[PDB]
Write a protein that binds this ligand. Structure first.
Ligand SMILES: CCCCCCCCCCCCC/C=C/[C@@H](O)C(CO)NC(=O)CCCCCCC
Lengths: 271, 254, 238, 55, 254, 59, 59, 55, 60
């Protein structure tokens, strides 16, 4: 909840509530009660919706891929290296804090589309997919059927099209006491090579694939990944991203104006 | 007998005096201190040089001009060459420390201008060329200040130094969220910040990671009438606070 | 009917779920439990056990039992190096295949101290002093007995106690380290050098062999389950 | 063994956790902590509004 | 943390700050306040606008020069055109109020001069021409300051503005009996007076009677060396205090 | 958003008394302005910023 | 000037007239080219409703 | 932590709120307030039925 | 400091014990015992060479 207004009458003193020294770096705790007369107002407004928890706690697409039901050579499955910088929306949000800590709520929205052919007599059964997570170091799949899909240890989800979207929870899997949103450092101790957040980045890959081919007719399924931070903790606020994003592995940008211009320094007709 | 301008700070064999100041900004309200047994991972006993390292090192000066866009100094490194600090820094794998940053600049009652002194933790910067990564020399030059530009930087591996974005793709006028003070020649003389150790890990290497960058950008361009002294220098003085070190071995950096 | 609202994740199959389920065999009377010796409760009780490290996995020796035999002999110079491998227990050709290594390869995160034990297997008439040392990552890798000695070490004299226990302590910027080889999570270097050449009387073998065992300390742990990269398969077996 | 918390109004709601890993729980939105003194007034010296920042 | 120069006054939506002052002269020691039932004659209930009227109105500025003899502003009227004050002033037959007068003028440490700021109650003035009476426009021009002269005024219906007599036939150097403060550029910056309602009757009409005149006369002529800023303005800001009104009706003035 | 129903008013600044300077001192100067909310400020209704766009997935 | 650091520099000088205006912008913190891009502006642009007092500091 | 209310008859029903935002709750239909005096008799002067509206 | 009251400047007064050479840079000198003196209203700064010797007394 917000602070309510205090009743104010006229004043005559050597007290200077109106003047400070911004050079201090301290922000003024000046209310309207100073510098003007005010009535009394019991303010009930709540800041409940601007809590860090609520600002972040909302599913957001972070990526998506494709894969066919058919293809000789295996080669008809997809993968994606987990990371939250390939999407503009959420990245900018998470990047309003230097360090953060939170659990994640994974939600997948799987859909299938059928493409044009010549194939006839098609009466396709339900489609069942498989999303498999592979922690870093684990054996990665090669073809739509390499042994590794047994997931004897790697966790994964099986899902039949037509049902409620799949969903899981992930604990704070960070190595350090928190996730790092930025890293003004290098990977190797001789500053040679990778520079940027891209070095802290290392959370395994996600593998998708059709379990059953369905029919002989060509089909293309798409998997959408949705993150949703929970039980959040945030440290060190930062200036929101001004320039548009240019790369997923770094801060790179092309210089941008601070805002838009108007005619005079006096124009109320804002841009 | 005092003025909230007056000020005397002492650490080791060094001492700072302030004839004109505001206050002293203190990190995020957090004052630096030695790592507790509860927040530690490194099991070996740490070294606490103390006086030998936690003292005032004064970097090379820089000249302020009517066109100067700004300056910056990465920090874990910048002191990589300062006495026993830089040393303990070369012989150890891990280290953590706080700091007392003191930027000093003085003009006359007839000069005018205004500087912004900030401490950006984790100031990752972009490259001038979208496809590459900025080379080390472009990022930091130890005690030698690096410079921002009043325009777009160019190719190869330099940093996109255009000031309006602080080389981080943000609005330069918002840096004020990080610890800072203003040096307004008209009323100021020096600025003093107390940055505590800030990182997502209890300790870190010091040559591989710069946990924060000091930036001195002028928002109010320096000016003066003819006849006034023309050379107005800026001098940065920093002092490590509560420096611990772990993982001793031979010295260098890969 | 009590009003119900199904939430996402329904009718889903999560490998690592954990719900109750109907028994296909009701009131089955299980065979009583016996008391077999050596019960295990946690995979760590395993990794706290010593196993021989194939340190000399050099030039074809990985195919022979010699892979475990560290060569040592009488030298005409001091400071010569005996061996060296990186503290990368998870993905290192030397370690990764030990008891500790095997376990590690079923996870992705690790943290803890390690015990390296050395056993001198030369004639009882042979003598010598060695310098076992661990140098954290940061500078290069030691290439002199000096340099190596500026690190954490123990000087092992070979008297009646033929087994020396060096103990690599946990020293990292982060709590855990990746099981895979990531330079962010570098682990440092392990080296051994002649402190005082091997001295032998007449009619006694100059060259001998040292065995090395790796194991975790009581502060060791692991996280994040994953399949081992060590076992493949092409079709169902028969 | 459940728990009752008040709802967001201008009445409560019961709740039980069914999973063993706390990460499975819902976001805690009934939270309301706040310290602006970190970001504003981060000066070692307390400032009186009535007074001047230089004296 | 203060200086008997510092100063913050607030009334309504207006606020005054004083970085350089002496004190605050207060009428004849009497602080303004609402008319008591014991001193009243008008039996109808009065209106007390309060915030809407008792606030700071800032008149048109005037430029001070090396020759400027002085200025003056009649008062009941001068605010005859200021927001709801002037209004309540047009719709009512009777009214009474106090004031907080604040004259502001600033130069540099290199300028010099000295002004006298006074509040002459009942400042009846003479005519330039013995046989006549000075016309209204010559007496007051609302918010537009009127001017004294460094010599004799001339004919018809003007006011005998020669400064030495303040147009009242007295010795200008004696005005100091009335409430006043001095603005001595060298040490000053502003002057502030608190005039209470002063009259031989509990209330009066506001368009027919000017219960006091503000005068700003320079005794120490303004001066400065070449190169110094040449335009030095003076600005008057006044605020009605405890204004009551009686006898409501249509608006105007006969 | 800018809705005339919910107009907010106007902010202006004026010379109360021109800038006075001695000889050999700059006549023109610069003023900096900072904005921030008071202890009675609040916000509601979450929505994406109109400030950040995107065309394809980044790389 | 939005491309330069001058965008933040309010011009002020010695004038031969009183009352001249210094600047002016509308209290529309959310969608105003001036404000909307500040710390306060940025935050506001992630919501749709707002209420509260504002502090404008001048240096 | 549930609650029992009576049903609409000529016996009760148990109920628990499962959501945190009170807006999620069902319509309160067990409500029964009423003031016709607003719309009828909104006169400052109370009127006696037996009497005339003019006397 | 005996300059006009309009003059400003900051100085670095420093004492470096014997051992290495004599400081020839502001750096080097600064690695020693020092005080940075700003010339404000207090025109007199007091540096204070502390006693630091291998022996108790020193020859005159
Ligand atoms: C069937 C179930 C499948 C479950 C799959 C779960 C996959 C893991 C999703 C984790 C998402 C974490 C998002 C946190 C943001 C960090 O990426 C950032 C953001 O800039 N940087 C960083 O990278 C921070 C550095 C921290 C390093 C952590 C190492 C694990």
């Amino acid at each position: 909840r917000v602070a309510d207004t205090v009743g104010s009458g006229p004043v005559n003193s050597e007290s200077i509530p109106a003047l400070t020294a911004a050079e201090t770096g301290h922000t003024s705790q000046v209310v309207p009660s100073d510098t003007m007369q005010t009535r009394h107002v019991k303010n009930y407004h709540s800041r409940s919706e601007s809590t860090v928890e609520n600002f972040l706690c909302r599913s957001a697409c972070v990526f998506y891929t494709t894969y066919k039901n058919h293809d000789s050579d295996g080669d008809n499955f997809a993968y994606w290296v987990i990371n939250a910088r390939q999407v503009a929306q959420l990245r900018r949000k998470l990047e309003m804090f230097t360090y953060a800590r939170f659990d994640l709520e994974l939600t997948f929205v799987i859909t299938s589309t059928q493409e044009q052919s010549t194939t006839q007599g098609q009466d396709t059964p339900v489609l069942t997919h498989q999303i498999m997570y592979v922690p870093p170091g684990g054996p990665v799949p090669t073809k739509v059927n390499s042994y590794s899909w047994q997931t004897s240890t790697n966790p994964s989800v099986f899902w039949t099209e037509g049902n409620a979207p799949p969903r899981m929870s992930i604990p704070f899997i960070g190595i350090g006491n928190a996730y790092s949103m930025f890293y003004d450092g290098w990977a190797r101790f001789d500053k040679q090579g990778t520079y940027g957040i891209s070095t802290l980045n290392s959370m395994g890959t996600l593998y998708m694939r059709h379990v059953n081919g369905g029919g002989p007719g060509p089909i293309v399924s798409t998997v959408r990944i949705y993150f949703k931070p929970k039980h959040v903790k945030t440290w060190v606020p930062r200036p929101p991203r001004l320039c548009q994003y240019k790369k997923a592995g770094n801060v790179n940008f092309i210089p941008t104006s601070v805002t838009e211009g108007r005619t005079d320094i006096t124009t109320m007709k804002t841009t | 007998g005092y003025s909230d301008r007056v000020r005397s700070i002492t650490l080791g064999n060094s001492t700072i005096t302030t004839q004109e100041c505001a206050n002293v900004v203190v990190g995020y309200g957090v004052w630096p201190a030695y790592l507790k047994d509860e927040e530690a991972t490194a099991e070996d006993q740490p070294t606490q040089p103390d006086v030998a390292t936690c003292r005032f090192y004064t970097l090379e000066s820089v000249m302020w001009q009517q066109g100067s866009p700004g300056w910056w100094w990465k920090f874990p490194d910048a002191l990589s060459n300062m006495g026993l600090f830089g040393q303990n820094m070369q012989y150890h794998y891990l280290g953590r420390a706080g700091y007392t940053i003191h930027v000093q600049c003085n003009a006359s009652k007839f000069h005018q201008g205004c500087l912004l002194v900030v401490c950006v933790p984790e100031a990752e910067m972009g490259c001038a060329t979208l496809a590459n990564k900025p080379d080390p020399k472009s990022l930091s030059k130890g005690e030698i200040a690096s410079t921002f530009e009043s325009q777009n930087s160019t190719g190869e591996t330099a940093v996109q130094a255009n000031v309006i974005n602080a080389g981080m793709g943000v609005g330069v006028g918002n840096l004020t969220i990080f610890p800072h003070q203003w040096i307004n020649l008209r009323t100021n003389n020096s600025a003093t910040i107390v940055m505590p150790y800030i990182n997502s890990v209890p300790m870190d290497n010091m040559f591989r990671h710069n946990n924060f960058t000091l930036m001195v950008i002028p928002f109010a361009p320096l000016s003066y009438s003819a006849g006034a002294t023309t050379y107005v220098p800026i001098t940065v003085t920093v002092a490590p606070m509560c420096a611990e070190y772990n993982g001793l071995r031979l010295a260098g950096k890969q | 009917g009590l009003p119900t609202l199904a939430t996402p994740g329904s009718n889903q199959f999560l490998t690592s779920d954990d719900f109750q389920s109907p028994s296909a065999m009701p009131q089955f009377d299980v065979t009583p439990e016996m008391d077999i010796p050596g019960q295990v409760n946690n995979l760590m009780e395993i990794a706290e056990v010593d196993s021989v490290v194939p340190v000399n996995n050099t030039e074809g020796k990985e195919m022979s039992i010699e892979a475990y035999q560290i060569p040592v002999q009488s030298n005409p110079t001091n400071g010569s190096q005996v061996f060296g491998f990186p503290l990368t227990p998870g993905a290192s050709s030397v370690l990764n295949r030990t008891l500790l290594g095997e376990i590690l390869n079923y996870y992705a995160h690790w943290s803890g101290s390690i015990k390296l034990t050395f056993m001198f297997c030369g004639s009882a008439m042979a003598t010598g002093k060695f310098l076992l040392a661990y140098s954290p990552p940061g500078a290069g890798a030691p290439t002199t007995r000096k340099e190596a000695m500026l690190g954490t070490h123990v000087i092992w004299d070979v008297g009646l106690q033929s087994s020396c226990v060096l103990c690599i302590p946990w020293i990292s910027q982060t709590h855990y380290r990746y099981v895979v080889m990531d330079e962010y999570t570098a682990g440092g270097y392990i080296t051994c050098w002649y402190q005082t050449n091997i001295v032998v009387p007449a009619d006694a073998q100059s060259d001998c062999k040292i065995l090395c065992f790796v194991s975790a300390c009581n502060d060791f742990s692991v996280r994040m389950l994953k399949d081992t990269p060590f076992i493949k398969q092409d079709n169902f077996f028969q | 063994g459940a728990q009752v918390s008040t709802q967001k109004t201008g009445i409560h709601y019961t709740n039980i956790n069914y999973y063993k890993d706390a990460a499975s729980n819902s976001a805690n939105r009934q939270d309301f902590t706040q310290d602006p003194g970190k970001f504003t007034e981060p000066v070692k010296d307390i400032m009186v509004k009535s007074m001047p920042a230089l004296n």
